[PDB]
Ligand binder design. Structure first.
Ligand SMILES: [Cl-]
Ligand SMILES: [Cl-]
Ligand SMILES: [Zn+2]
Ligand SMILES: [Zn+2]
Lengths: 21, 30, 30, 21, 30, 21, 30, 21, 30, 21, 30, 21
């Protein structure tokens, strides 16, 4: 759940790269 | 780096910038 | 002359409004 | 790719729908 | 299609995409 | 009132086309 | 080479900040 | 049109104000 | 002109439009 | 504090030009 | 052919996500 | 300037970081 992870919580450049290809 | 709740449109443009060439997948399960 | 890059920003935005809860995968090159 | 199909010519909302999930 | 409260800037860019060629009118009476 | 309609409520692609020309 | 289309996105955004509560009508072609 | 007047040359906030309501 | 709380991304794009040539500085001390 | 000024309050085109160069 | 202007919009957006709380100064010409 | 360095060629997140504070 990226929404719960990055929009319902805080997201560093790294917790954001996980959702890349 | 930014420290804030990134949502909808902002969240997508941000994934776009980080992943750049790699690309990404967006699936709002919440 | 980094047109393509600027255009990718608008596509994902559009993909986002169009797909909605179905989501999508963005992959620039095949 | 979609980059070549929509960044050269204007895709429509219907054309963009093919790329969803 | 997206299911969410579209507001200000997002609302306008969305009208832009749907109407495309037709164009649109924006009047925030609330 | 589009604001009350699309921002204060939910708006499908159709309730959005009404505001087109 | 869909420049004009990308540009329209930025115009309406600008029109939106500038007109405010007065609103506006977007009509690409006369 | 405004597309021809602002997408070829850069309009200003004052120029853009003509197109309001 | 717009009358609303301008935040993050919107706030920056707005400074961009007003200042235009002059440029601007963004420092979120809150 | 521009955030407190323009995001936590209202900002007219003028209270926004102050933050220009 | 106002490319550079459209591009500036995307840069500040990017600068905004990248700098975060550190902020930045945007100065087009030296 | 950055306009000339990033609007002609694509800068990276690492390149963009030089311009921060
Ligand atoms: Cl927002
Ligand atoms: Cl663009
Ligand atoms: Zn927003
Ligand atoms: Zn753009």
């Amino acid at each position: 759940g990226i929404v719960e992870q990055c929009c319902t919580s805080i997201c560093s450049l790294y917790q954001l790269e996980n959702y890349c290809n | 780096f930014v420290n804030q709740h990134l949502c909808x449109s902002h969240l997508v443009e941000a994934l776009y910038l980080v992943c750049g060439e790699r690309g990404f997948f967006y699936t709002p399960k919440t």
